[PDB]
Design a protein around this ligand. Structure first.
Ligand SMILES: Cc1cc2nc3c(=O)[nH]c(=O)nc-3n(C[C@H](O)[C@H](O)[C@H](O)COP(=O)(O)OP(=O)(O)OC[C@H]3O[C@@H](n4cnc5c(N)ncnc54)[C@H](O)[C@@H]3O)c2cc1C
Ligand SMILES: O=CCCc1cc(F)cc(F)c1OCc1ccccc1
Lengths: 661, 132
């Protein structure tokens, strides 16, 4: 439906109020069901009007004229709902033509560290709300980990490049606001073993299915056997997969032993039967000789001599009957023994070729999580799964940077300004920064509030890139330690001609060892100009950063030559190699749910910091230091949409604090 | 509740995780276990192959022809004397006694046991059979 789709598209249950709405409308959620339904319709309809045209501001006055009775009768209720949606960034976010131009009286001063998407989205919001906003960006560009290479006609993304399903995705609204050339990613992905030969269709499917079953198995291992701690440490997805694979190899040997034991039991039953026959044959042989001697006593004979012939005769036919039955049983056993000898269970759980293709599927997962599987929390690594959007995944053909560049229009952004120190007190904040081009030029920024959107990698640095004065409390630094910050890298290869399959967006290279499974394992055909992207995932990400570009590009061309032929692959005209772990403004690619961590640490990351009183005995200070970024949003971590959402969240939180709700 | 064709007992899980090298040890002992079962199959195949080679010839040089005799009702003296000896040797095995005489049904043998019980000391004869 329509108003129902608006709720779904806003990640909202259409027939129930959320925890957030309860907080802002406690009178309604604690009241009768009828008013809650009226509220829910007002909310869903206002969402719909905004979604049905997100290029212009949906004002309260506009909203009311479009509501019909009975819902437009409590105008206070409608105004309250509208303002709630506006403040929390569910309507009038992103890039929209403003009806009422921005009032000149600005209230409050906020410094935003970082002008990636999270920082940019917050800033746009905070400006919309009337605050004075300045962003401090270390790099010479906006976007952070949205980073588009551009040279000539070549356009290729070194960071984020995939928009997940548009259903429920706030990037859908953004894509109607910015010219993004979104294109579906066809998921078909042929694999080529290390020798360049394609993986036969039978094997690609047998192993993908086994890969999926191995994942299920770890989840069974996690939930049903409570196998979540081993040797006093948290179990990882990697360990669990090892244990599952070991047990499948064990079951194969158990099945082999059971099989040959049925053969031994049957051979031995046959041995016993043959011994019974050679003895019976000898007994028959000797008895026949007796019958022969007795029957050669020529008649006329007395009746004992006759009895001897006739009873040896009878005794002999009985033993022959006994022997004939034992030979019928010998055929029944040689049957079992030949059927068994022909029904041998599987020789191996996975062949070496199998295991290598399996490792490609593990590398593909190491890619999706930007970390080796031995670091992923077994209990929690797929906790954001029940929030996946609906629809096909897409790429951005004109380069994802079009989004942050667009969000930056109109904002006060100081590029080449590396924050070194964040000072926050009961009376306000000071951010000390330097010019990255000459670190001696020092800058002091005073403000009412600091929104920190530094990447989790930067927060993790020891010794620190950014000092907090006073230091961050233990509950926040402990979260920063526990949370995973992973790594993932790309090689952009720009050719003058297309030698790959044009109707194929993905293809895989199957590395020959487990260790190297992440090394150039996947290639992307996503763009208009002939460009392939190659991924370096898992353990390979960090190791390939200490290898020169020429060698990395060399390994690529070697792989592609093996798949497409040596004559088909020219030298690239342009090449780029990301090194995200070494990027001091990133120190990795995105967060992952590490063993020993959990979804609650993402909540801890988002909690703002409140300084203590300047004067002792003075009233409780307001919060001064806020946090956004992909590491701060429990349900959508490690994405662009998650970062965008986190900025919208904090802008509502800051505006509630400094403008009042 | 594990996936079909996955095998994951609590028992086996602990056995493969209780130690740093528990897994490879477990699988090594199953490798040697399978080796010694295959070794044992080889010895029996060869033992049984030697036994089969002794049964070369079946029992065919030793099977008599199967004669049928019209089951007659009259007891010749010679047939009565065969029965008494068959009682002495086979006891109450009425079938074997019939097979020895040739032309006497199992029942006719049974009837013989009573009608000539007195005159042939059949009781003494059965007692005589039970000694050896
Ligand atoms: C290789 C790669 C592939 C990815 N794939 C996808 C994908 O396809 N789709 C998707 O949705 N997500 C993907 N992601 C994740 C996504 O890119 C990020 O989650 C998101 O873009 C980060 O947003 P953010 O605003 O939290 O952080 P950032 O964009 O990192 O913003 C932080 C900003 O702070 C700046 N900064 C750092 N230190 C300082 C300092 N001392 N002073 C001042 N400024 C500083 C940084 O330079 C940066 O501009 C990928 C990421 C990478 C790196
Ligand atoms: O290049 C960037 C990919 C990084 C990424 C990290 C996430 F946490 C969630 C994502 F959606 C995602 O991007 C698309 C993707 C989806 C599934 C599997 C792999 C990638």
């Amino acid at each position: 439906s329509g108003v129902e789709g608006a709720a779904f598209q806003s990640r909202l249950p259409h027939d129930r109020m959320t925890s957030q709405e309860a907080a802002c409308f406690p009178d309604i959620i604690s009241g009768p069901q009828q008013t809650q339904k009226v509220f829910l319709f007002i909310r869903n309809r206002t969402l719909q009007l905004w979604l049905d045209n997100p290029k212009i501001q949906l004002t309260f006055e506009a909203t009311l004229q479009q509501l019909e009775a009975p819902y437009n009768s409590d105008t206070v209720l409608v105004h309250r709902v509208h303002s709630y949606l506006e403040r929390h960034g569910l309507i009038n976010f992103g890039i929209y033509k403003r009806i009422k131009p921005l009032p000149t009286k600005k209230t409050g001063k906020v410094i935003i560290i970082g002008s990636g998407v999270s920082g940019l989205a917050a800033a746009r919001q905070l400006q919309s709300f009337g605050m004075d906003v300045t962003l401090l960006e270390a790099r010479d560009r906006v976007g952070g980990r949205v980073a588009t290479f551009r040279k000539g006609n070549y356009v290729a993304d070194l960071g984020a490049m995939v928009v997940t399903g548009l259903g429920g995705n706030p990037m859908a609204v953004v894509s109607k606001q910015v010219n993004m050339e979104l294109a579906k990613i066809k998921q078909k992905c042929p694999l080529y073993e290390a020798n360049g030969q394609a993986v036969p269709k039978e094997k690609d499917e047998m192993v993908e299915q086994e890969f999926n079953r191995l994942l299920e198995a770890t989840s069974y291992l996690s939930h049903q056997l409570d196998f979540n701690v081993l040797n006093n440490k948290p179990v990882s997805l990697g360990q669990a997969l090892e244990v599952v694979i070991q047990l499948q190899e064990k079951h194969v040997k158990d099945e082999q032993i059971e099989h040959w034991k049925k053969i031994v039991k049957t051979q031995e039953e046959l041995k016993e039967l043959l011994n019974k026959m050679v003895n019976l044959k000898e007994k028959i042989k000797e008895l026949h000789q007796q019958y022969k001697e007795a029957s050669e006593v020529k008649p006329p004979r007395d009746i004992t001599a006759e009895f001897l012939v006739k009873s040896k005769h009878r005794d002999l036919t009985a033993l022959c009957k006994e022997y004939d039955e034992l030979a019928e049983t010998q055929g029944k056993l040689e049957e079992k023994l030949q059927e068994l000898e022909a029904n041998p269970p599987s020789d191996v759980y996975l062949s070496s070729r199998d295991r290598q293709i399996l490792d490609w599927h593990f590398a593909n997962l190491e890619f999706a999580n930007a970390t080796p599987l031995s670091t992923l929390s077994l209990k929690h690594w797929d906790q954001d799964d029940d929030f996946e959007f609906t629809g096909s995944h897409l790429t951005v053909r004109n380069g994802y940077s079009c989004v942050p560049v667009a969000l930056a229009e109109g904002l006060d952004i100081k590029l080449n300004t590396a924050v070194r120190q964040v000072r926050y007190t009961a009376s306000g904040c000071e951010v000390i920064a330097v010019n990255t081009r000459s670190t001696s030029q020092t800058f002091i920024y005073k403000c009412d509030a600091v929104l920190c959107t530094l990447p989790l990698g930067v927060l993790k640095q020891q010794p620190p890139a950014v000092q907090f004065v006073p230091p961050l409390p233990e509950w926040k630094t402990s979260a920063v330690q526990r949370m995973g910050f992973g790594n993932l890298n790309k090689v952009v290869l720009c050719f003058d001609r297309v030698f790959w399959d044009p109707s194929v967006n993905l293809f895989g290279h199957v590395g020959s060892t487990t260790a190297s499974r992440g090394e150039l394992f996947l290639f992307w055909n996503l763009y208009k100009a002939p460009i392939l992207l190659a991924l370096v995932a898992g353990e390979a990400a960090g190791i390939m950063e200490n290898i020169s570009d020429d060698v990395i590009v060399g390994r690529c061309l070697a792989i592609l030559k093996g798949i497409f032929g040596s004559s088909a692959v020219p030298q690239p005209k342009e090449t780029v190699v990301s090194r995200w772990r070494a990027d001091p403004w990133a120190r990795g690619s995105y967060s992952y749910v590490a063993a020993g961590s959990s979804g609650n640490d993402y909540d801890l990351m988002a909690q703002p910091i409140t300084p203590g009183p300047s004067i002792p005995g003075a009233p409780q200070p307001i919060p001064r230091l806020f946090f956004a970024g992909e590491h701060t949003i429990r349900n959508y971590p490690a994405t662009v949409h998650g970062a965008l959402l986190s900025g919208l969240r904090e802008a509502g939180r800051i505006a509630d604090q400094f403008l009042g709700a | 509740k594990p996936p079909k064709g996955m095998f994951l007992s609590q028992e086996d899980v602990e056995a493969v995780s209780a130690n740093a090298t528990a897994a490879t040890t477990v699988l090594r002992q199953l490798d040697m276990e399978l080796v010694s079962v295959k070794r044992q199959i080889q010895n029996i195949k060869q033992t049984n192959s030697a036994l089969k080679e002794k049964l070369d010839g079946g029992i065919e040089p030793y099977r008599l022809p199967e004669v049928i005799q019209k089951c007659n009702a009259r007891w010749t003296t010679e047939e009565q004397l065969l029965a008494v000896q068959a009682i002495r040797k086979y006891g109450r095995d009425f079938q074997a006694i019939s097979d020895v005489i040739g032309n006497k049904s199992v029942v006719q043998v049974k009837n013989f046991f009573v009608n000539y019980r007195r005159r042939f000391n059949i009781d003494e004869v059965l007692q005589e059979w039970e000694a050896e």
